[PDB]
Amino acid sequence: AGFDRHITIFSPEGRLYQVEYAFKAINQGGLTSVAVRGKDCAVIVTQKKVPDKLLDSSTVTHLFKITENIGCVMTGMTADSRSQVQRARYEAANWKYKYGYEIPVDMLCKRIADISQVYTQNAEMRPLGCCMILIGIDEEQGPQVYKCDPAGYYCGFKATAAGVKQTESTSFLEKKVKKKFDWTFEQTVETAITCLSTVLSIDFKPSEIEVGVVTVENPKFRILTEAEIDAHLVALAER
Amino acid sequence: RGYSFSLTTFSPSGKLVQIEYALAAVAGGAPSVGIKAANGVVLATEKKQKSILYDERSVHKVEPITKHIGLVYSGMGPDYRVLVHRARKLAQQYYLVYQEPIPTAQLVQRVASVMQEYTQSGGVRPFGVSLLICGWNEGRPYLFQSDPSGAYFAWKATAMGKNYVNGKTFLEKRYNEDLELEDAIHTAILTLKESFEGQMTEDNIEVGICNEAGFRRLTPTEVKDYLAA
Amino acid sequence: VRLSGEARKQVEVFRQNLFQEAEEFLYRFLPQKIIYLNQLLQEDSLNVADLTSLRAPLDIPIPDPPHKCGFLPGNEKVLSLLALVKPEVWTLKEKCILVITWIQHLIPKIEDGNDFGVAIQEKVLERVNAVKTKVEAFQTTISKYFSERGDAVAKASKETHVMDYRALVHERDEAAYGELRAMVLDLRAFYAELYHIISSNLEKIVNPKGE
Amino acid sequence: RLSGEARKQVEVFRQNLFQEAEEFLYRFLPQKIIYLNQLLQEDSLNVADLTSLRAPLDIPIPDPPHKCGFLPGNEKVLSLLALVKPEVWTLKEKCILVITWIQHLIPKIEDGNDFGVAIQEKVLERVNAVKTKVEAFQTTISKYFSERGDAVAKASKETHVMDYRALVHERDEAAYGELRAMVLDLRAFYAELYHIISSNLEKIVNPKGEEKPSMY
Amino acid sequence: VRLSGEARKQVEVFRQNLFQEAEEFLYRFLPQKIIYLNQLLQEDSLNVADLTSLRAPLDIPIPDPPHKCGFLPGNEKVLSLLALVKPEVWTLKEKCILVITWIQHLIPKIEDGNDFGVAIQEKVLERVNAVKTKVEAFQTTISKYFSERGDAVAKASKETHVMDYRALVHERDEAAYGELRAMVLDLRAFYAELYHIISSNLEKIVNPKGEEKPSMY
Amino acid sequence: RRYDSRTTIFSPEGRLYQVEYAMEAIGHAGTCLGILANDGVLLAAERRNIHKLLDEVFFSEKIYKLNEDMACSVAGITSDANVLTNELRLIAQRYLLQYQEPIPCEQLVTALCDIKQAYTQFGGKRPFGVSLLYIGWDKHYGFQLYQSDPSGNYGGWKATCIGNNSAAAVSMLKQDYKEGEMTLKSALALAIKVLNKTMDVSKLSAEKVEIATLTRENGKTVIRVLKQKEVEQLIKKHEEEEAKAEREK
Amino acid sequence: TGYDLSASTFSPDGRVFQVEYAMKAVENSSTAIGIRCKDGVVFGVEKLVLSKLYEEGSNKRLFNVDRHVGMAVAGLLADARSLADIAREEASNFRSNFGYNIPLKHLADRVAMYVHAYTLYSAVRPFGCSFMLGSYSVNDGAQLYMIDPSGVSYGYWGCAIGKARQAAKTEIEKLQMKEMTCRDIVKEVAKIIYIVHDEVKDKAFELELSWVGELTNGRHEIVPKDIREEAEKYAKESLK
Amino acid sequence: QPEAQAKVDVFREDLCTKTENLLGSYFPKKISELDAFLKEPALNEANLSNLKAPLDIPVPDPCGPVNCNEKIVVLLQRLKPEIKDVIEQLNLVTTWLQLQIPRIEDGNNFGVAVQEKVFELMTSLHTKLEGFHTQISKYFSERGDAVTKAAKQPHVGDYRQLVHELDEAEYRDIRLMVMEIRNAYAVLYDIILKNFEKLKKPRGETKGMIY
Amino acid sequence: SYDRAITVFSPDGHLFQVEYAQEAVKKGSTAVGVRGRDIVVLGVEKKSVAKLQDERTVRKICALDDNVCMAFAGLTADARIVINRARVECQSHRLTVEDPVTVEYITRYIASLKQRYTQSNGRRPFGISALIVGFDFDGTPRLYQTDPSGTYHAWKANAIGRGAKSVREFLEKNYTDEAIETDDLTIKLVIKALLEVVQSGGKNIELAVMRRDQSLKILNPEEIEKYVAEIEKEK
């Protein structure tokens, strides 16, 4: 063949197989992340797996804060994830400097995604093998959830997942939105945790998951403590 | 052979085959339809979503470059956005220089020049997207297509994407120059109705129109009203 | 092609039966065959230490130096070993055919890229075809034993003066015993290698082009 | 330094080859295709139950514990053979003609602009393949008589064995099936030759193409 | 290596004889042979239409159901056609050998580049070796005909009751006639293909490396 | 093996095969024609795009005006054609800015051909897969017709055709063209004749051709595109004349 | 398979194999370990003596990348020295601009991003070094970080790199570093290195140790030779 | 000449219709029929001692006519039509695919490669099925030669065993041939159905119009 | 193997792409140059009119300056570029040193340009060889030749292009001090030499002369007809 092995060249069917391989690179990590939106809150959950006891559990995280009121969860290569996180933080601060107001979540996602496009069009560099999911509150639009992928697609979502169990998780979430009644903050967090736990079969403990939330009442992105996570987990088991 | 992989290499029989492959990438893209009515021009495309989870309001396949110009695409979504930003920038440069809204013909020339600019260098790939650029200038409608090759053509009506040949045949059967846009939108949704393989709804399609007023994306309620027929 | 309802049903039942049989062979029959071949190897008849013991009695009159031949039977020992091994040989050939067609049905539509899965599938079916040709060679040798021993015995009876033909008959029996024991061993090895390859590469074999 | 006679001789050979190629391609191939289709429609090639074409063998069955009369060949299969054999020889002749025509059309060897030459070699290997298959069919036709004669001679010599008698009947059956397959593939070969030559004719006749602007 | 004047003379004599003979052959002998084989296949004997004209009597006494076979001649038609064909095939093999040697002596010193001319020489050598193998196949099958027919008639005489051997003898004769006409066609075609390829590529064949360069060295 | 890649490697026997492969591309293009006459020079082209749902919004699909005093018709890749025409217009206007006189025809052709040669020679860029005819009037040499190729080599022609069936067009023009005797009307009739011969369509549609003429009137060049009525009249006259020639026999 | 030739490429199954091949580089290296305790961080390296000719205190794998941080490396020594120069430049730039000693987490992030730059581009290979960084500041505390050739960075209570990583990691795991103090940790680091050293394959080694902590007033420094000798004697005694 | 193209196009249209009908109906039906024959009790016999046929040859201390194994002969008589049919259908689809091959061109060689792969598997199937057809023929000759050897040498015991073993081997080979013909039909249907778009339309209708 | 890049040397140290460009020169139309005592004559064959082409556009002989002219055999576009570059260098040299260019100076410059294109990959050699003629300040006639490689050599008389070997053999035979004695004899010598390799005499040769202190003169077709007639008659 040879139509793979370079991002620039098109297949005879015009598919650009290299970026599709970058999509597989996300699943190679073996972790899953889920994001679900609510009427007044947006949450991100992801597996936290510590391979060795010696590792400091505090340092390992896939949840990062792009700015005070935006948070992200990265899935894929850890290094590419950290690099994209840094680029996102730079883009947000530069937006604030130039335009005088906090970057919208959609525009941040668009900037990061079009950067991913310049990666998937120029020859020498490779697409970053990571996926981003951004959550924030916009005053006009309420909560928001968005996802960047290695291709440059940046579509917004009511709820999403990324990682190895993405298809199972989106099947689960699709059923839940179809039986739409609402999602308050507690139900939002419960839906996220139930989705992740059901698709993985994990039956989590508080250490195994890390959750981050935004709410219209408290717009700042915060990563909940193990105690708060256990509080939500116990509520799930009780009912 | 070696002609297949290189972009700056004419194959034997003189074909730049990577560009043909980019056109094949366009053909895989979703259906898009453009019909130039006497008093307007309608751009329509399917916005079929993988799941209910997708939020339709987040992204649009039909975008305004200017007040009186808008365009739609079939092909690669990221490439579409690169060139839609570049098109908006080119139009604003024209407005700064001449203090007049850019003509549709001039804009399609400039964006096609950009698309050609990309094909020449080996380090870059062609844009795997084609566009239908519609506009109303000088009290006249316009419809244009711009391919990955960097070439542009002027169509009374045409279709891109999946089943574009069959859609074009359906159009040439159904097309009348005397059509008003009220009828032309119906013909466009029918042209797409040929090729969905699904039950079209207000969400599953995105359609926009241009006229003396200018380009606009008619709302989900509007397209529901037109779909009711 | 227009698909009749009955035709669709027929193709679907074939595919279903094939995939069910593939799972059954891989997970139930194959280990049972491995343990069976283990115990067969452990049997005393198949691990005879002294090959001169199975030297058959060939009764043809030594010619007096300067009358007729009675019935000469075949070696019961090697015949019994053949009775044991031959079913296993043909059984492995059948199951190899099953695995080959199962893999071929799992091969997807041809596309330009993401072809590493089909490459893995092609590698596995290449090994399976190699196992099948070795098994067919065992069948050829099993067929050859009878004809070769008959030629040798007939030649010895026709030419009683030459003793080397009698020595040859005894050698044919010894070589047959060795070959049959090797056949049992490598049948077990082929079964195990098939399990190893398929189990190791199952994800790509069943799902080559990603999702 | 060609003589006038030499140049005229090679010229007439080239022209006759070209005319024969055109005549074959545009007239002979369709006519033979329809004719072979008619042969396939014919009932002789379309015999359903091969027990019918089984021919009696009058070797005396031996009594449990004198000379066989003239034992004839099977009339049906030998007649079918009489039908098919000329067509096979004809196809071999015409494929040789196609090979010669292509080879004469092959241009002076030069680097570059070799795609037409590659097309020529590709069609040449295809016609060589059908040449291999038709000569193989000729060999099968030839071997049938010898093997059946050996079989019937063996059956006569050893009357006790009836496997040889079954072998004679089986050889007749296999010969009938092979003859039907031969006619079918002769039709297919003529059609495939027409398809490849007609589809790639422009490059086959003019591989290098039109003369260029001549940068020099 | 040190060469005597006599040694140089002998080598130059072989070289000049080979070159002049190759020129004479391709320019004169090849057209003559092309037309000769053409008229020969146009001859009526080669274009026999009814193959039963070719089949010859085998006087094997058919066995009556319940004495000796006379001299069984070879097929006069086939042996006469073979007498015509055999000089031509051996002649073609000789001339292909001459062409091979001519091109090989024209092969230049081995060198790193400008190897396109020697590549042309190698390609035409590939073609001439191919036709050499083909004519060798013709030469062996002509003997195979006689051996096979002799074995067939011996079998038919030995086993009179089998008529399939008699049919086989007739079939061998018919197949031989078909092979012979295809053979003369192929011989003419090989002569013509040799002429075409050599004439087309003679410049690079005779002068592969090409004219002397300006000598930047 | 392969000495046809990268457009910078001389193959053995010293041939640049990339430019030859590019010259192969123009043959696929729609035929374009130019004829030189005593009173004027014309460009005629076959609008290969004959899709029903296409609009003739532009001045011409194939014919381009480069300057007040000259025009061009293009056969080859349309994108490279657009680039080359933009470069041509800029070159002409640069000369007018510098010398305050119109660009000479040969000078403009030579400049663009220098660009086209440059793209051949340097490694990364492909040769321009374009061949285009130039028509213009200059004070030094009057009416002139020029042809260019992907190689960057140009020549002056009394009449020539580029594109599909260019050999047939040139063969027809050779016999028909009368040196020193043409007028614009006769040249238009000849153009219709050779176009009818080359173009596969039995009847020239008069929407499947575009004809433009360059003439000097009142001391100023005028480049005009014959309108559909004019070319309809021309094809009607040619059909009548050819039928009358047929009727006599 | 041409997927493994370059780092720009992806495998069809989503793996960048050049980076993994570079990760295999460090395993060729002799082991090095760093352990973090309450007082500070201790580093240790098993520096194999290739020849008697080579001077002692040469081929140092323990570098000082700033006064308050030290670096221990495994993998290609050239790439490691270059990475140390990069880290020193980053620390100096941080001091010059922001006016204070660089936080270790930030320094690890910057050098990790510099490393991660190389995995992307085709022109340049990934680094062939994996290195540990450690510092003590009264504000931040004891911090130990490890950077792989990929540019992944994490904080480790105990860490090992090189050939004997796994064995060293289990030995470190059975230690309870959090409660312990540095002057004991040097002895246990010596014990672990002497354990994992293979006498048959590796002829001899000279234990190279360093620490940073409150006992230094937050300066990374090479161990005083008396303490080195005490720890080495203890390690030889425990080895039995 | 357009008349030749007209006739050849009539032939190719007939081929396309016949091949489409073949895939739609005949291949599924034959898969069903052949698995039905496979599951028939006759093809799968528990003990080949029942398969054994008598040899009336005398045994030493002119023979009565020995007979073919009627079991083997009836199984072969039902098998041989299946082999001829599958070979005929394979030839039909092979010719169809060869006719669909487009004009050779530099670009868009994908679709030609798909046809090449399918043609490769068709060639492999052709080889194996022709081997089956040869095997059926040689069985009778081998059995006849063995019984004649036994008659010439009544004393030689293992020639009887050679005859019996040839019969058993042919039985097992018959059932394997039935399996392989079934699987050949299935895999051909699967491959052609999956790749039909490119097989029927290799280049594709799309025209770029860069010119 | 070693023929795909200009930079790479071969085993035995042959740079083969420059050799291929030198081969490309051989394809071109013939050109011939001869040094008379007071004339330098430069003659070039003409391929064909084609009957619908204007001869003025195609001219192989060109004047770099008042005192220097060249003819080329090889790629026409490359020749045009090299001619323009040498012309601008001529005027620049006059600008810089207030003196007219010497023939060896301009052939050195052209050779240096061709050499510059050979040395670096990413650029192909100019596929031309040239014959530069001029009169120096002393008034001595000068003839120089250049090739794609970048070496330059003075020649009493030479040819380039197709049939260069044959015509230069003829010229080695014919050339002598006697022939150079007369200007008409020099012109007739070059005309006979081109007649050695050309289809037809008058139609297919374009010839020019430079005198001691006069500009280039392309001889009229009538004058060439008269000279070939004089040459034809003498035989």
Swiss-Prot record, chain B:
Q: Which Gene3D superfamilies match?
A: Glutamine Phosphoribosylpyrophosphate, subunit 1, domain 1 (3.60.20.10)
Principal subcellular localisation of the protein: cytoplasm
> Which keywords accompany this UniProt record?
Acetylation, Cytoplasm, Nucleus, Phosphoprotein, Proteasome
Q: Which InterPro entries match?
A: Ntn_hydrolases_N, Proteasome_alpha, Proteasome_alpha-type, Proteasome_asu_N, Proteasome_sua/b
Q: Which Pfam families match?
A: Proteasome (PF00227), Proteasome_A_N (PF10584)
What top-level branch of life does the organism fall under?
Answer: Eukaryota
Q: Into which family does the record put it?
A: Belongs to the peptidase T1A family.
Q: Which protein are we looking at?
A: Proteasome subunit alpha type-2
Q: Which organism is it from?
A: Homo sapiens
Swiss-Prot record, chain D:
The Phosphoserine modification is found at: 3
Which Gene3D superfamilies does UniProt cross-reference here? Proteasome activator pa28, C-terminal domain (1.20.120.180), Proteasome activator pa28, N-terminal domain (1.20.5.120)
A GO biological process of this protein is: regulation of proteasomal protein catabolic process
Induction remarks: By IFNG/IFN-gamma.
Q: Name one GO molecular function term.
A: identical protein binding
Methyltransferase recorded as keyword: no
Summarizing the function annotation, the protein's role is:
Implicated in immunoproteasome assembly and required for efficient antigen processing. The PA28 activator complex enhances the generation of class I binding peptides by altering the cleavage pattern of the proteasome.
Q: Which family does it belong to?
A: Belongs to the PA28 family.
- This chain belongs to the protein called Proteasome activator complex subunit 2
Q: Which organism is it from?
A: Homo sapiens (Human)
Curated annotation (Swiss-Prot), chain F:
InterPro entries registered for this protein in UniProt: Ntn_hydrolases_N (IPR029055), Proteasome_alpha (IPR050115), Proteasome_alpha-type (IPR023332), Proteasome_asu_N (IPR000426), Proteasome_bsu_CS (IPR016050), Proteasome_sua/b (IPR001353)
Q: Which Gene3D superfamilies match?
A: Glutamine Phosphoribosylpyrophosphate, subunit 1, domain 1 (3.60.20.10)
Phosphoserine modification sites? 11, 73, 171
- CC terms in the record's Gene Ontology section: cytoplasm; cytosol; extracellular exosome; intracellular membrane-bounded organelle; nucleoplasm; nucleus; P-body; proteasome complex
Which keywords, in A-to-Z order, does the entry hold?
A: Acetylation, Cytoplasm, Host-virus interaction, Nucleus, Phosphoprotein, Proteasome
Q: Which Pfam families match?
A: Proteasome (PF00227), Proteasome_A_N (PF10584)
Q: Which residues form the signal peptide?
A: none
Family annotation (SMART domains): Proteasome_A_N (SM00948)
Family under the similarity heading: Belongs to the peptidase T1A family.
Subunit structure and binding partners? The 26S proteasome consists of a 20S proteasome core and two 19S regulatory subunits. The 20S proteasome core is a barrel-shaped complex made of 28 subunits that are arranged in four stacked rings. The two outer rings are each formed by seven alpha subunits, and the two inner rings are formed by seven beta subunits. The proteolytic activity is exerted by three beta-subunits PSMB5, PSMB6 and PSMB7. (Microbial infection) Interaction with HTLV-1 TAX protein favors NFKB1 activation.
What this protein is called in its record is Proteasome subunit alpha type-4
Q: Which organism is it from?
A: Homo sapiens
Report the gene name.
PSMA4
Swiss-Prot record, chain G:
Residues modified as N6-acetyllysine are: 52, 201, 225
Give an example GO molecular function: ubiquitin protein ligase binding
Q: Which keywords does UniProt give here? A: Acetylation, Cytoplasm, Host-virus interaction, Nucleus, Phosphoprotein, Proteasome
The induction comment states: Down-regulated by antioxidants BO-653 and probucol. Up-regulated by bacterial lipopolysaccharides (LPS) and TNF.
Give any Pfam family that matches: Proteasome
Instruction: Classify the source by domain of life.
Output: Eukaryota
GO terms for biological process, alphabetical: proteasome-mediated ubiquitin-dependent protein catabolic process
Q: Where in the cell is it found?
A: Cytoplasm; Nucleus
What PROSITE patterns does this protein's entry cite? PROTEASOME_ALPHA_1, PROTEASOME_ALPHA_2
| InterPro entries from the UniProt entry | Ntn_hydrolases_N, Proteasome_alpha, Proteasome_alpha-type, Proteasome_asu_N, Proteasome_sua/b
Q: Name one GO cellular component term.
A: cytosol
Principal place of residence: cytoplasm
| Keyword Coiled coil attributed | no
Q: What does this protein do?
A: Component of the 20S core proteasome complex involved in the proteolytic degradation of most intracellular proteins. This complex plays numerous essential roles within the cell by associating with different regulatory particles. Associated with two 19S regulatory particles, forms the 26S proteasome and thus participates in the ATP-dependent degradation of ubiquitinated proteins.
Q: Which family does it belong to?
A: Belongs to the peptidase T1A family.
Name the PANTHER family for this protein: PROTEASOME SUBUNIT ALPHA/BETA
Name of this protein = Proteasome subunit alpha type-3
State the organism named in the record.
Homo sapiens (Human)
